[PDB]
Design a protein around this ligand. Structure first.
Ligand code: MOO
Ligand SMILES: [Fe+3]
Ligand SMILES: [Fe+3]
Ligand SMILES: [Fe+3]
Ligand SMILES: [Fe+3]
Ligand SMILES: [Zn+2]
Ligand SMILES: [Zn+2]
Lengths: 496, 87, 319, 118, 493, 325, 118
C-alpha cells in the first residue's frame, strides 16, 4: 500500500490542511495585517509547529490539570491556608500581582486571540489561539487563587479598576497596550519571544517560588499547574522568531529592532518584580541580582549565542541592565516607600537580618548607597516623621515609571534624558527609553501619563488623596500607607 | 427527633447548604471545623428541582453524595429526592 | 473575613460570596485609558465596544447559562472527547468504515468530510470575535466555540483518515471536492465571504446563528437518518459529539440573541437588516448539499426551525 | 518611525492647552535622592522665580536636612541641560521656562547624606 | 409495565442470585443459624442505598482524584509545619497504630460477611462497605505517610497494633466482632459502632484536625465519610430488618446492643483523652461531644426503636456520668505509663486547664487540677513521674482498671468473679456482665500485661520489651513531650 | 520553580523499609504490604474450629511470604477505582448509543432470543464469581492477595450488571427478558452442567483451590469462548451490534491475565509441593470447566471454539509448569 | 453460653501453669490514685507476706508521699473483697493468696492529696 503518515505530517493534515487558497475573496483582504510592519514572509508552508496537541488532547490534559488545582483551591480555602503564610507583609506581593501582572494575563488572551485570526498560516493560527485560551485560563485561574486572600486582606479588591487608573500600574498597562496596538509580527516578537521566552523566568520564578518559600500554597499550585502551559508558550516564542528571521534577509534588521525595543521595555516592566522579590518576600529565594545573572545573563547569553547565525546580536544596553541588577530593587523600594500614600499595597523598613542579607547579596552597593537610606528613614519614623513625598514625580514618556534610574557606573546621578519633538518636550528614564521614543515618536506622545492626567483634572480630584480614594478606589487608611499600623498587620497579630 | 447531615465546608457545598436551607423552613445550620452541620426536627429533604434552578444544569442526588461527610436518619433515596427522617 | 468577593463583583451582585463563574467572567477586561491607538485600525480604539454597530447598555447582560469559565469548559469537553475517543476506537478496530463499499466511502468523503472546511471557517471567525468583543462573558464564549470548531474539524478529518489507513489520500480527495466540485462552491464562497465581515456581531450572527442553525440540523440530524438507508449507519457513532455540541450551543446563542435583541428595538432592526441579507446566502450554500443528500425538504424543514427560533427574538426570515 | 495601516498622526495628550491655563515644570536637585525622582509641578506661567522657589520648591524640599541651609536661587541652575541664570522677579514664561521644561538646581557644598547622594 | 428505581435496582442485584438445585442452600450458607437469629424472608430486606458498580466507581473515583491532589500538595508544601503545635501529632500516633488498623479489620470483617449472608441484597452492600474500609485503610496509610517522615511514633503501626499493651484495647474489640458470627458482627459494627458512635469517633479527630492546621487528616477524615453515610444507613436498616424478622431475634438483638454499646463505649474512652488533650487548639469537651453525639442524637434513635420492642443499652447511665471524668482519668493513666507508648504525654498549659475548669465545672478543679499541680512540682524537682509497675487490666475491654464507681470518683469500680477455678477482674459491671454471658470466649484474651509476665513479649525488663518487641525507640517515640526529639525539631521553626 | 525542602527523619514506614529498603516508596507499596493484623489474636473464630482469625492455613498452599504475590497492575484503592471509572464511562457511551439508535430492539425475535439464552445467563456465573471472590477476599491473609480478590469480585458484580442490562435494553426496562433468560439458566438442559459447576464452587473450602478454579480455570476458558469466539460469530448471526456492549469484558479479561498469571506463577514456582496441589486440583477441576462450557459451544460457535480456548488455557498453565488440554 | 458452630471450649491463657512458678497478685491501695489502677505484681508463691510488703509493695508505692509513713503490714486488708488478716511469715500461697487474687490495703489516716484520693 501507500505510506502511513508520520507524526509531523499527521498533525498538519489535522490543522494546516484545513485551510485553502481562497478563490472568491482576495487573500490580502482576508489577511490584511501581514504587510504594513514590513515583514516579508516568503513561504508559509515551511512553518514548523511548536507543539502538536489536537483538541481532544488539549481538552483531556487540561481537564485533569484543572481538577487537581480546584480541589487544592477548595481545600486551601476551607482550612484557611492564608493563615499559614510566613507573615502578612508577603500579601503585598499578591496585591502587586493581581493588580499588576494578572490583568496582563487577560490582555494576552485578548492579543493572542486577535493575532490568532490575522495570521495567514493556519498553523501560526492554532499555536496562537491555543496560547490565547491558555492566557484566559491563567487569568481566570489567578482570580480564583486570589479570591480567598481578597477576603482576608486589603489591596486586592479592585484589580481591573486600578490597572486602568492607578499611577504605577500604568507601567504594565502601557506595556501591553504598546504591544497590542503594534502589528502582529511585533506582537509575537514582544510577547512570545521577548516576554514569554527571554524574560519569562524573570517574572515567573520569583512569584512562583516566592509563594513556595513563604507558605503560600494556593499560588504555588497555580504555578506548578502553569508550567506545562509555559513550556508550550516558550517553544512558540522561539520557533516563531527563528521562523521570521528565516523567511527573508530584510526581516533581520526589523526583528533586531523589535528585540532591542522589547528587551528594554521588558527589563523596565520587570523592575517591579525586582523589588517584589528582594523586599517583599519575608523569606528570600534569591536576590534580583542572582535572578538576572542566571536567567538573563546566562540563559539569555546562550539564547543569543544561538541566534548569531541569523545575524542577530544581543539587545542594546543589556550592559546597562546588567550593571543595574545591583541597584534596581533598592531604587524601586525607596520609590514605593515614599509614595505608598497612593498605592494599594503597604511598604515598610526591612528587618535587620533582611538588611544583613542585602548587604550579603549586594556587597558593592547596599552598604554604600542603600542601607544609609533605611537608617535615616528609621530615625525619622521613630520621631513620628515617617517619610511621604507629597509632590508627584516626573514620569518617563516611554516606560511610565518615575525617573528614578541612574547613570551606569554613577549610581548617584539620575540618568535623565530630554528631547524636543514637534515643539513639545518629553522626558526619559534612560538611553533605552529615549531610543524607543525617537524611533516611534508618534505612538508615545499619545501616552496617558498618570501624573500628567492628574494635573489635567482627568482623574476626578484636585488633591492626590481625593484621586486615590475616589478614582483609584484605594481605601485611605486601609489599602494604603506603611505596613506598620495597617489594618493587615493588626489582623495578622490577632491570627498569630 | 433531630436528623442531620454534615457537608464539606466547600465551594459546591455552599449550594448544597443553600438548597437544604430553602426547602426546610426549620432546619438549623451551624458551622465548625471545616464543615457544615445541619440538623432539624425529625426530617430534612433535598429536591432535585430546587438545586437545578440554582446551578444551571441538571444534577442528581448521587453528586451530592460526593461532599457529605456524615448523614443521620432513615433513607429515602430517589431520582427526585433525598429525605432523611424518623417515623 | 473583611469582604466576600471582589469589588467589581460586589458592585454587580451584592456583597456576598460570588460564584466561580462570576469571579472569572465580569469586569476583568481592561476598559478605559488605553495608551495608544491601534496601528492596524483607524476607526476604533483598543478594547472598543463600537467595532459592532450593535449598542448595549452593559454587555454583561449577555452571560452564559452553561456557566463556562475555563475550568468548566475543559472539564466538560474532556468528558465529551473521552466518549468520542471510545467511538473512534471501536470503529477503527471493528473496521466499520474500511469495510464499506467505495461508493459509500465516496459519499462520506463528499457530503460529510468537507465540512472540516466550514469548521475551519467558523474557527477563524470566532477568534476574530473573541478578540474583538469587549466583554469577557461574550469574548470567552467565542474562544470556546472557536476551539470546539477546530476540534470538530478534527473529528471529521479523522473520518477521512480511518478510511485511508492514515495516509491522507482521503483528505486530498475530499478537499478536491471542496475546491473543484460545483456543489461546494456556494458554500465555499459563502464561507470566504464571512472571513471578510468587519462587524463582529454581524459575524456572530451569520456564523453562529444562521449558518449553524441550518447546517447543523441538516447535517448532523437529517443527513444522518438518511445515511442509514445509504448503508452508512455506522458513521453516526463518530458524530455524537457534533450532535451534543449543537444542542448545547443553542443554550448560549439563544441567550445572547435574547439579550442582544431584547435590548433596544433599534438593535432588533440592525439584526433584521443583516438576517435579510445573509440567511438567504446560507440557505443557498446549503442547497446543493441538501439535494445531493436527503433532498431539499431537509433544508426547508431546517429553515423552518431557524426562522422559528428567530421569531422568539421577534426577528424573522421568510417562508 | 511608526508603521501603520493609515496616516498615523495624533495630537499629544500633554499639550499645554490641556492644563487649564497652567503649565508643567520639572525640578531635579542632584545629590538628594531621598526624593526618588525630579518633581513634577503644576505651575503658573506667570508667577516669578523667587515665588516658585518659596511657594513651591522649598516646601517640596522641606523633608530633607539640607532644604534649610540651601540657598536655591544662588545655586547653579540648568534649564533643559543648558547653563542658565534666572531673573528673580521675572515670570517663568518670560524667561523661557515653558510647559515641560526642567530646571536642575545644583547646590554645591550640600551633597546629601552618608556620601551617597541621599 | 416498566420498573421503578426500586425494582430496576433489584433486577440489577437481587435477581442474579437463584435457588440452588445442586448444593444445599445451607451448605452454601452455613453461618446464618448458629447465632440464634432467624430469617423468614431475605426479600424484605430493603437496600438503603441503590448503587451500581458503574455508579460506585464513578463517584468514588471523583473523590480520589481530589483527595490525592491535596495529599500531594500538603507533602510538596510541607504542610506539616502548619499544625498548631508538635504536641498534636500524638493524636496521629494514636491514630495510625490504634484506628487505622480497625479500618483494615473492617475490610476483612465485611468481605467475609459479604460472602456469608444468604440475601443477595445484603451481600453487595457488605461488599462495598468492605471495599470502602480498604479505601479508609489505604488512604490513611497515605495521609499519615508525610507525618511518618517528619515525626516519631508512626513508623510501625501494624506491628504495634498486634503487641503494644494499650493497643489491645482496639485490637480485641474487632477480634471480638470478627470471631463472632455475622449478625452479631453486623449489629456490633454497622449498627453499634458505625452508626451510633461513629460520629463520637470521626468528628472529634476530624474537626480537631480542622483547628490545628492539619489539612491532610481533615481532608481524608471528611471525604472519607460520605462513605460512613452509607455505612450508617446499613446499620440502621439491618437491625430494623433483623428485629422485625422474628419476635425471637429481639432479645438476642438486645443482648447485642447491650454488649457493643459497652464495648463501643470503653474503646471510645481513648478518643476522650485525645480530644480534650492532644488538641492544642480545643474544639469541644469530650463531655459536650458525648452529650450531643450520644445522649441526644443517640437517645433519639433508640426512640425510633421502641416501636420494635428494644430498650436503650444497659449501663448507659454509667457512661453518661463518666463523661465528666474519662479524659482526665485516661490521660493521667497514659501520662504515668508513656515510657511504654509510641507517643508523648505532658501536663496541659495554664489556658488548657482553665478551659478544662470551665468545660468541667464540677469535676476538674476538685479531682484533676491538683493532679497536674503535684505532677508539675515533681517534674520541676527532677522527678517527672513514671509508674514503674504495670496495671491490672480489665479482662474484657482490656483497658487498665482505672474507671470510677458512678458518683464516687475516688473509688475504682473493680469487679471479680471466679470461673471454673480461675480468677478474673473487670473495670465495671458493664464489662463483667459481658464476661458472664460468654466466659469460654474471654478466658482466651491475650492480655498484654500477663503476657509480658508469662515472659512472651521478648524481654525480662519492660524497657527491653518496649525496645525489641514493640519496636519503640527508647528516647525517641517514648517519654514526656518535653525533652523529646519532636519537641527539639518543632521548636526550631 | 525553586521550592523549599526539609530533611526527613525517615523515608517510609518500618514494614516498607524492612521489605524494600530505606528509600521513599510508592503509593502501592505503602497501601499494600504488612497492613493487616498478623498475630496475637484474642478469641478463636466461633464459626471455624480449624483456624484462627487471619490464618495462612485456610489453604493447603504454603509460601514463605505471601507478599511474593503482587499486582503487576499496581492497584491500591484509588488507582483501582480510577481505572474502572474510565472504563465504565466507555461502556456508558456504548450503552446510550445502542439505545437511542434502537440497535437491539430492532432485531428479529429469534435473534434477541439468542442473546437471551446465549449471553445474559452468564450473569449467573458472574454472581457466582462475585461470591467466590468475596469469600477469598475474606480468607486470604496478605493484603496484596486479598485486595486483588475484592477488586475482582466487585468487577464480577459490574459485569453481570452490564449483561443484565443488555436484557433490559431488549425488553425496554420491563424485566421480562431478565425473566425469560433466568428460566434458561434454571431450566434449559444446556445450562445445567454450568449451573452445577457454579453451585459446586460455592461449597469449596480451600480459598486457593477456589481462585484457581474460578479465576484461572473457569474464566480462563469462558471469556475466550464468549467474548472472543462467540463474539465474532455473532456478526455472522446478525448481531454485530452487541459487541459494543461487551467491550468492557474484553478489556477486563486482557487486564485479568496480568494479575492472575503473576500469582499463578509465584505460587506454582514456590515449591514442588504447591505444584502437586495445583495439578491435583487442575485434574479434578478443569474437565469440569470444559464440560460446563461444552453445551454452550455446541449451541454457539461450535466445539472448535471450546477446543481453542482449551488450548489457550493449556498454554497458560505450561508457563507455570502444569498441564491440562 | 457462647454460640459457636462446634463445641466451643478452650484452655484459659492465664492459668498459673503458664507463669514459670510465679503468680499474679493485684494490690489496690485506695485513696492513692496517683497510681491509676491496682498494680499487677508478679510474685513468688513461697515468699512471706512480710517480704511482699518490703520487697515489692514499699517499692511499688514509693512515689506517693504517704508511702513512707504507711504501715502496710498493719493496715486494713481484704483478700478478694473479703476481710483478711495477714500472717507476716506464712508463704503467700500457704494463707490463701493464690494466683490472681487481689489484695486491697486501706491505710487509716492516709487518704492521699487535696481532698481527692490522689
Ligand atoms: O427482580 Mo427481583 O425483584 O429481583 O426478583
Ligand atoms: Fe500567562
Ligand atoms: Fe504564558
Ligand atoms: Fe471506615
Ligand atoms: Fe465505615
Ligand atoms: Zn523609561
Ligand atoms: Zn473493661
Amino acid at each position: 500500500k501507500n505510506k502511513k503518515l508520520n507524526l509531523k505530517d499527521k498533525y498538519q493534515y489535522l490543522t494546516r490542511d484545513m485551510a485553502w487558497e481562497p478563490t472568491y475573496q482576495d487573500k490580502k483582504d482576508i489577511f490584511p495585517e501581514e504587510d504594513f510592519e514590513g515583514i516579508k514572509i516568503t513561504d508559509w508552508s515551511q512553518w514548523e509547529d511548536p507543539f502538536r496537541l489536537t483538541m481532544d488532547a488539549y481538552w483531556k490534559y487540561q481537564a485533569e490539570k484543572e481538577k487537581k488545582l480546584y480541589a487544592i483551591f477548595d481545600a486551601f480555602a476551607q482550612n484557611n491556608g492564608h493563615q499559614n503564610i510566613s507573615d502578612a507583609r508577603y500579601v503585598n506581593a499578591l496585591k502587586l500581582f493581581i493588580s499588576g501582572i494578572s490583568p496582563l494575563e487577560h490582555a494576552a488572551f485578548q492579543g493572542y486571540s486577535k493575532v490568532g485570526r490575522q495570521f495567514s498560516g493556519a498553523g501560526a493560527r492554532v499555536a496562537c489561539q491555543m496560547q490565547a485560551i491558555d492566557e484566559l485560563r491563567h487569568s481566570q485561574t489567578q482570580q480564583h487563587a486570589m479570591s480567598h486572600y481578597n477576603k482576608h486582606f486589603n489591596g486586592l479588591h479592585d484589580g481591573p479598576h486600578m490597572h486602568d487608573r492607578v499611577w504605577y500600574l500604568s507601567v504594565p498597562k502601557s506595556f501591553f497596550d504598546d504591544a497590542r496596538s503594534a502589528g502582529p509580527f511585533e506582537f509575537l516578537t514582544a510577547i512570545s519571544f521577548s516576554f514569554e521566552y527571554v524574560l519569562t523566568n524573570l517574572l515567573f520564578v520569583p512569584f512562583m517560588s516566592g509563594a513556595a518559600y513563604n507558605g503560600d500554597m494556593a499560588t504555588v499550585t497555580f504555578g506548578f499547574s502553569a508550567q506545562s502551559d509555559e513550556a508550550r508558550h516558550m517553544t512558540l516564542g522561539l520557533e516563531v522568531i527563528k521562523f521570521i528571521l528565516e523567511q527573508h534577509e530584510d526581516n533581520v534588521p526589523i526583528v533586531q529592532r523589535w528585540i532591542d525595543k522589547w528587551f528594554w521595555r521588558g527589563f523596565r516592566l520587570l523592575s517591579l518584580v525586582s523589588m517584589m522579590m528582594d523586599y517583599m518576600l519575608p523569606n528570600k529565594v534569591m536576590s534580583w541580582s542572582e535572578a538576572w545573572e542566571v536567567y538573563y545573563e546566562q540563559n539569555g547569553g546562550a539564547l543569543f549565542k544561538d541566534l548569531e547565525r541569523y545575524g542577530i546580536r544581543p539587545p542594546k544596553y543589556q550592559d546597562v541592565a546588567n550593571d543595574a541588577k545591583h541597584h534596581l530593587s533598592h531604587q524601586l523600594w525607596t520609590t514605593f516607600y515614599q509614595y505608598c500614600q497612593a498605592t494599594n499595597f503597604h511598604t515598610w523598613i526591612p528587618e535587620k537580618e533582611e538588611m544583613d542579607w542585602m548587604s550579603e547579596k549586594y556587597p558593592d552597593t547596599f552598604d554604600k548607597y542603600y542601607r544609609p537610606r533605611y537608617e535615616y528613614l528609621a530615625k525619622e519614623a521613630a520621631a513620628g516623621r515617617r517619610f511621604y513625598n507629597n509632590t508627584l514625580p516626573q514620569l518617563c514618556q516611554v516606560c511610565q515609571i518615575p525617573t528614578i534610574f541612574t547613570e551606569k557606573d554613577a549610581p548617584t546621578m539620575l540618568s535623565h534624558r530630554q528631547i524636543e519633538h514637534e515643539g513639545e518636550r518629553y522626558h526619559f528614564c534612560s538611553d533605552g527609553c529615549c531610543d524607543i521614543f525617537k524611533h516611534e515618536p508618534e505612538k508615545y506622545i499619545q501616552a496617558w501619563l498618570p501624573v500628567h492626567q492628574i494635573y489635567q483634572g482627568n482623574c476626578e480630584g484636585g488633591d492626590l488623596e481625593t484621586v486615590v480614594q475616589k478614582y483609584y478606589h484605594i481605601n485611605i487608611g486601609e489599602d494604603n500607607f506603611d505596613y506598620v499600623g495597617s489594618p493587615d498587620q493588626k489582623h495578622w497579630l490577632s491570627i498569630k | 427527633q433531630l436528623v442531620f447531615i454534615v457537608f464539606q465546608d466547600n465551594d459546591d457545598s455552599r449550594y448544597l447548604a443553600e438548597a437544604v436551607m430553602e426547602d426546610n423552613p426549620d432546619a438549623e445550620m451551624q458551622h465548625q471545623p471545616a464543615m457544615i452541620r445541619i440538623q432539624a426536627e425529625k426530617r430534612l429533604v433535598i429536591n432535585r428541582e430546587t438545586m437545578e434552578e440554582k446551578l444551571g444544569r441538571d444534577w442528581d442526588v448521587q453528586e451530592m453524595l460526593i461532599n457529605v461527610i456524615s448523614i443521620a436518619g432513615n433513607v429515602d433515596e430517589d431520582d427526585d429526592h433525598f429525605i432523611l427522617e424518623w417515623n | 473575613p473583611i469582604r466576600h468577593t471582589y469589588g467589581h463583583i460586589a458592585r454587580r451582585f451584592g456583597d456576598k460570596p460570588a460564584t466561580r463563574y462570576q469571579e472569572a467572567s465580569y469586569d476583568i477586561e481592561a476598559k478605559t485609558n488605553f495608551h495608544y491607538r491601534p496601528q492596524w485600525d483607524s476607526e476604533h480604539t483598543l478594547n472598543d465596544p463600537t467595532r459592532t454597530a450593535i449598542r448595549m447598555e452593559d454587555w454583561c447582560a449577555v452571560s452564559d447559562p452553561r456557566q463556562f469559565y475555563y475550568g468548566a469548559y475543559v472539564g466538560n469537553r474532556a468528558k465529551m472527547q473521552e466518549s468520542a475517543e471510545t467511538s473512534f476506537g471501536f470503529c477503527e478496530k471493528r473496521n466499520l468504515l474500511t469495510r464499506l463499499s467505495e461508493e459509500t466511502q465516496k459519499q462520506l468523503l463528499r457530503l460529510l468530510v468537507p465540512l472540516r472546511h466550514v469548521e475551519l471557517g467558523a474557527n477563524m471567525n470566532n477568534a476574530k470575535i473573541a478578540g474583538d468583543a469587549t466583554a469577557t462573558t461574550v469574548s470567552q464564549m467565542h474562544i470556546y466555540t472557536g476551539m470546539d470548531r477546530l476540534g470538530i474539524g478534527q473529528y471529521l478529518s479523522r473520518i477521512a483518515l480511518m478510511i485511508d489507513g492514515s495516509t491522507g489520500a482521503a483528505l486530498d480527495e475530499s478537499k478536491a471536492y471542496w475546491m473543484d466540485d460545483e456543489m461546494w462552491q456556494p458554500m465555499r464562497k459563502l464561507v470566504e465571504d464571512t472571513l471578510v465581515v468587519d462587524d463582529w456581531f454581524e459575524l456572530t450572527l451569520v456564523q453562529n446563528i444562521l449558518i449553524d442553525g441550518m447546517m447543523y440540523p441538516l447535517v448532523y440530524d437529517k443527513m444522518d437518518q438518511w445515511f442509514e438507508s445509504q448503508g452508512a449507519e455506522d458513521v453516526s457513532m463518530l458524530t455524537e459529539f457534533m450532535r451534543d455540541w449543537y444542542k448545547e450551543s443553542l443554550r448560549w446563542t439563544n441567550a445572547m440573541m435574547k439579550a442582544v435583541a431584547g435590548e433596544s428595538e433599534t438593535n432588533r432592526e440592525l439584526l433584521q437588516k443583516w438576517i435579510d441579507h445573509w440567511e438567504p446566502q446560507a440557505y443557498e450554500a446549503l442547497k446543493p448539499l441538501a439535494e445531493a443528500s436527503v433532498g431539499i425538504d431537509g433544508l426547508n424543514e431546517a429553515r423552518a426551525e431557524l426562522s422559528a427560533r428567530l421569531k422568539k427574538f421577534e426577528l424573522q426570515s421568510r417562508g | 518611525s511608526v508603521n501603520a495601516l493609515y496616516d498615523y498622526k495624533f495630537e499629544p495628550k500633554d499639550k499645554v492647552e490641556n492644563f487649564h491655563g497652567m503649565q508643567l515644570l520639572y525640578v531635579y536637585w542632584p545629590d538628594h535622592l531621598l526624593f526618588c525622582a525630579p518633581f513634577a509641578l503644576l505651575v503658573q506661567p506667570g508667577m516669578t522665580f523667587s515665588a516658585l522657589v518659596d511657594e513651591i520648591l522649598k516646601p517640596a524640599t522641606a523633608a530633607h536636612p539640607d532644604s534649610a541651609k540651601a540657598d536655591f536661587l544662588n545655586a547653579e541652575w540648568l534649564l533643559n541641560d543648558e547653563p542658565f541664570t534666572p531673573k528673580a522677579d521675572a515670570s517663568l514664561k518670560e524667561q523661557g521656562i515653558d510647559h515641560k521644561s526642567m530646571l536642575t538646581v545644583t547646590t554645591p557644598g550640600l551633597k546629601g547624606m552618608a556620601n551617597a547622594g541621599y
